[model samples]
Target: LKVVSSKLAAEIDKELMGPQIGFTLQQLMELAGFSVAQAVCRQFPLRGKTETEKGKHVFVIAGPGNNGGDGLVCARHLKLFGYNPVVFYPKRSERTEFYKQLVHQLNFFKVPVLSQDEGNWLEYLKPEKTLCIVDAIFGFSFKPPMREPFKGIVEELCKVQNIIPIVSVDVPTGWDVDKGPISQPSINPAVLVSLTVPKPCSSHIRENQTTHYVGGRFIPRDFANKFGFEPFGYESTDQILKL
Candidate 1:
């Protein structure tokens, strides 16, 4: 069998991975997002190319669900760290209270939120700037053949991939979590910050080209030891680790 890990495996791994004590999804999201930003900063430095372009400006594509919530949290921290964070949130119906709180934090930080009506995203892609993009559109749970808006979003991202660099949170968009497509469309991010553990799809990552990192430091060592999975070799002070 070619299978090793899947969406279900990753989810259960995280459920037992939590600190090994007690925690909530909110706490996990908090840690996950923070670690994600850390990994991004390490891989993609916010060095503005020109004088007019600000190094602190980064674009974050956010969808609806826990993954989006993670992006929202990452955006908030980016702004707080003096990086001008712009968010594009297309979905509205399924947001939970924790998600709203993230919105409130970003608003409080005076973060900018972009809309679908905001014209071409390329306009914001100043040639002299970092133009860093965060692909939080979809993660491990999303299925193929996608849905409306997302299908089109994937098409637009394909173009974006050709120019500016992109980093994916958890799993890259448009990928099969378990099987790791033999020939499927993906954003082909330069870096992937896989929380907790790398999924089966991670096996498909083009090594030497794409940098992979495993995050989710909230999991204690002893707890993970009994889980029977290999360690990620994270240091005590590390929130994320290079894989």
Candidate 2:
């Protein structure tokens, strides 16, 4: 299977939204987010059939970009699917109607929204009460050394990896989209769901440890042919496929 660079990823999105495809950003985001939720559910079911379970908390660390929007959508659906989702959305991009609606929907659904100022997110992240962490911070476009609150949060995530799994959306934060991890102690998620297709950075993911899944069922046949992408081999009626 072929992987896409950050630049090509952007081009694909533009073409998907362009006049030829006519798909709106919100429409694509909805499917992408839903696909992410599906992958999370498959790996970590709300209640195991063989083993007993409790209502474990899924902490979603959301950023300010469109990737964060996908995180918000995933949180809502995870809630609908009977998982407790606590969202940390510091540095929110609330200027747009789409972003505003995403926040409002979370409120309407009564999901707990955490803040960077709030110091207790780590306490909630303790392995006993948590299920997994959702890394929706940066996507294929992310570059360079990470800033502020996000960097510290990622560092914390790295420490907790032995106990808890992190499901990263698109590209893992702190990773160079084409080159790979930016730092020695960068975030290494357990499950990486690459929306649309696998990003070039995915090639460096530790396959023995991380489970890779491809989401985003919105790609058209013509575009697939144009890009020379083979069929993703998605199971019947599925939006995501494990690789």
Candidate 3:
């Protein structure tokens, strides 16, 4: 598992498309989502595990720029694999248009979207019976000190003692991907699916625990050719079954 920074994705885009290419933010997000899914399914075979013995493998994704959009893509993929993925997006209308598009797509899939007002979110925090959790809240783009609902969710998620395995996308929500500091109580995912190259914070124990790298937007081939080395692969069941 390798840890990657969101800046790397941005940098790669800038390099590949050139600064004047004018790729929309949403398009970049979709690129990240699509690429990460490809890498994860290729390297990790466990993600395709049957949900027969477990309950819903819900993804509690937050809305923050492209990170949340990536989560939405993961949720759709999970559903395709026969796992019920319920997306919980905090009530915030200031999200990017691309994020909104992902939300719209989820709606098209008829996936249930839960807000803070729905009820006590703690009820859905059951880790024991749940199959897995995809945490796609904050990422490397975040500075520090999460606000309001995001802060609250992070606090609650950290305290879950016996829940399902958590797979954090990009970077953990409340932690600073560059500085390696956790501002609030954070969820320690069993696996951290980072995009592109590794971030300094991913290896920092004080900030996060258990991490994996998932290449997004910027392909591994480009990275290998440019950096002169083979990157670590992200394992997912979807890639193994060719679904």
Candidate 4:
């Protein structure tokens, strides 16, 4: 995988997203989610060592965009892989088909979708039953001083004595991808799966536990070449490229 500016990531999203890139957004969402789950599993296995430490739960926090859709897809796959994932999706995207289908699958699987205005998600950080937290809130499209539960949520998680093992999809939630900062004390994910390409701000992952990767094989070769983006291929090699 290679490094790219957040501006470049946004540019690609704008220019070649749909028909131009040769893959629909729905297809990309699945691919991105699948890749992210694989990366997450590799880090935190479904089975833990001790009896009290059962690695079964994955709490996924989704927002109101394509990134949230990716989280829903990830939760579904995690359930199929035998992990209990509780989702906290406060909002949904305008695109009805993909969002509806994703919600349908979650209900079919009986995965718990948590209430919106209730408890602090940071309290759910238990390595015993909880494997990790999937942060799919805001991607490269997020802004600072975030709204409602998200702002408070991020802030509280940052205050936790033990920084939870977070797996952030695309870009970290609290971050403003265009800019170089996030909440003063932000969510530091252990694994960051940068779909399509690595954004500029991703380089700022400070914690020693952080491991970054680039995935998204759905992008056609000619399309990536057209824009001079040399995305990593994880087909036969691995589920993602660790950076």
Candidate 5:
């Protein structure tokens, strides 16, 4: 798979929103989140005959940005796909309307949304019961010196990395976009679904440990060509590519 620098990733996102492409953030976010859910399904298929039999609990940890928005959408889709998803959204974005709508949909689906104050959220993730942990806590825009509450949350998550699989959305939480997880308190994801394209940090992931996939199916052909992006060889109607 082709890799782009974090800067290029941000630039491509901006250009997609430009007049030429005119793709709204919400539109892309929906596709991105859905692609992530699809990737999860591909990696961990729902087994058994009934809901009780398919005891795959997915803990989706979301932040307060567009990455979080994608997580919320992903949780909703996970429910539709028959997986039990619990959202941990301690912080809400400044632009509340979009998040509110996503939350509303999640609420309609009867999925639980946990806030930051809830210190016991991690207790719910039993190793045997959990299907995976979605790390939507940060994206390519993430920088070092991780902030409050989340710092503790990530630290806690690190302890359970071996017991349960952590699936990162775009960029793994606490990882430097281009530098990778060199900084302190970074997550080791079992699966990483890079939206649009793989950021430079993706190269740092342990190939033997992490199964990587590139998502986001809304990029136009000309737009991709303009950026000199290699084709992702999406088969039939597949939106996510396993690497």
Candidate 6:
């Protein structure tokens, strides 16, 4: 979900995983990744499509957090489905432990990690071959105005010609998850797969900038609807469910 702070999302998770439900944070993380991957695969017709037409090559840009971990897990699944997925960790080593673990697991697959100085990542884009670019880079955790390699990556991806399509794990990298402000040169994804819930920013409408965008639904609306939780708005009722 789009939020001004990741802390708000954590609070929601806490309610979802209290003692009554017996669900753990780790379980929710895995569920989020697995469910999102399932949605993407189903949409892409992975099971029925042939090898050559299945679009074997995928490029993923991972950041630091469970969101990035989600991309790693998706990449692993893509490999199992006979697609070649490459992950790029663009941040420093000291950022987050989740990212480190994702990198370690992705290493087992021998996926090539792109360095910040690796020129333009879009150079490998191919449209007819179904080359998907997974923008798992900074999602909902970015500060305003954008920054280094991330801004560069966003700019380059937007200009990539002949690329099959972009599947963003959460919100677009350069867009402000909370403020709904998309910086210039933002990565306009063809499909944005949000985790846990849809971000407020994703539903935002701006003139002349709505053509190259699609949202993938995965979060359980039943849970949010049952509790009557409205993000960016005051809680209608104090009633809460264990799961």
The numbered model that scores best in lDDT is 5
Worst 10-residue lDDT window for candidate 5 reads: 47-56
Q: Give the TM-score comparing model 3 with the true structure, all chains together.
A: 0.74
Ranking by lDDT: 5, 2, 4, 1, 3, 6
Where does candidate 1 stray beyond 4 Å?
Answer: 1-4, 7-21, 46-56, 118-122, 125-130, 182-184, 225-227
Worst 10 residues of 1 by lDDT: 1-10
Off by over 4 Å in 4: 47-52, 93-95, 118-123, 126-129, 235-237
lDDT of 4 by residue, 1-243 (tens): 355676667778777665654657777788888888778877777565454455457889888888888899999888887777888887665567778789889999998777565644545765555667888888887767688767877775565425467888988787767555645776777788888887777777764868887777666677677667765656585657776
> Where is the poorest 10-residue window by lDDT in model 2?
46-55
lDDT (0-100) at residue 5 of candidate 3? 49
Candidate 6 residue runs with Cα over 4 Å from true position: 1-7, 14-25, 47-55, 95-98, 117-122, 126-130, 161-163, 205-227, 230-243
Would you estimate the TM-scores of all the predictions? Answer: 0.86, 0.95, 0.74, 0.87, 0.94, 0.71
Q: How many steric clashes between backbone atoms does each model show?
A: 1, 0, 15, 0, 0, 2
**lDDT per residue as tens, model 1, 1-243:** 022366455556566646764578787888889888887777755565454555536788888877788899889877766577788888854437888788888889898877666645546555344457888988777776788787787776777675777788888888887766543456788888887777778888887768888887765666555554655678778889888
Question: lDDT tens digits, residues 120-210, model 6?
Answer: 4554565653367787776666667666766776777787622456777767777778666557766666666655554567666332433
User: Per-residue lDDT tens digits of candidate 5, residues 1-243?
Assistant: 578888888899998899987899889989999999999888888764467647758999998888899999999999999889999989886667989999999999999998877646866567866778999988999876888878888998898887889999998889888888876656899999999989888998888999999888777677777777865777789889887
Q: Model 6 misses residue 219 by how many Å?
A: 8.3
**Which candidate model has the greater lDDT, 2 or 4?**
2
Candidate 5: deviation at residue 146, Å? 0.8
Q: After superposition, how far is residue 101 of candidate 2 from its true place, in Å?
A: 0.6
Q: Model-by-model lDDT, in order?
A: 0.74, 0.86, 0.61, 0.76, 0.86, 0.59
- Residue 221 shift from truth in candidate 2, angstroms: 2.6
Number of the candidate with higher TM-score, 1 or 2: 2
RMSD in angstroms, all models? Answer: 3.2, 1.7, 4.8, 2.6, 1.7, 6.9
Residue 196, model 1: lDDT of 74
